Amino acid sequence: PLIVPYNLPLPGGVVPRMLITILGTVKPNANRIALDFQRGNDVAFHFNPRFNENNRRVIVCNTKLDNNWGREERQSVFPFESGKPFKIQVLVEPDHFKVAVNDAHLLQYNHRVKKLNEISKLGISGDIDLTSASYTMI
């Protein structure tokens, strides 16, 4: 496997038609997963499944600028399950990140950080065994 937290460099940043594919398995009794698309210290797109927030499962998405979190976008559709293998696909489209899990569309996140080619790293963290993380141009 890959060691978590795992960094995936995105050479030259992201660009529309770039597809990121993450395969892993959720640990037993998981609490959280996070994807952090970084522009230096800023987080352009934070994607954060939470398995127990006040006894609810929710995906929280946000942007961090100068160490400040912005407005959360929350999604109560929650395709992850403790103990089970998953696939996350993040497709960069011109105006949003488009996320599908296990081949089903999940959410979109409008670009707040505009300098896409400066979003040069993806951090993958949380309560998972990470099997693979890669990108391709489609």
Ligand X SMILES: OC[C@H]1O[C@@H](O[C@H]2[C@H](O)[C@@H](O)[C@H](O)O[C@@H]2CO)[C@H](O)[C@@H](O)[C@H]1O
Which residues in this chain contact ligand X in the complex, by CB under 6 A?
Answer: 46, 48, 60, 62, 69, 72
Whose Cβ is closer to ligand X: residue 21's or residue 62's? 62
Q: Which residues, 6+ apart, have CB-to-CB distance to 87 below 8 Å?
A: 21, 22, 23, 101, 102, 103
Q: What's the CA gap between 109 and 56, in Å, rounded?
A: 21
Point out the annotated binding site: 69-75
Task: Name the residue number minimizing CB distance to ligand X.
Answer: 62
CB 60 within 8 A of CB 50: yes
Whose Cβ is closer to ligand X: residue 69's or residue 81's? 69
Shortest distance, CB of residue 111 to ligand X, whole angstroms? 17
Closest CA to 89 of 75, 106, 101: 101
Whose Cβ is closer to ligand X: residue 69's or residue 132's? 69
Shortest distance, CB of residue 71 to ligand X, whole angstroms? 8
Coil, helix or strand at residue 21: strand
Point out the annotated binding site for a beta-D-galactoside: 69-75
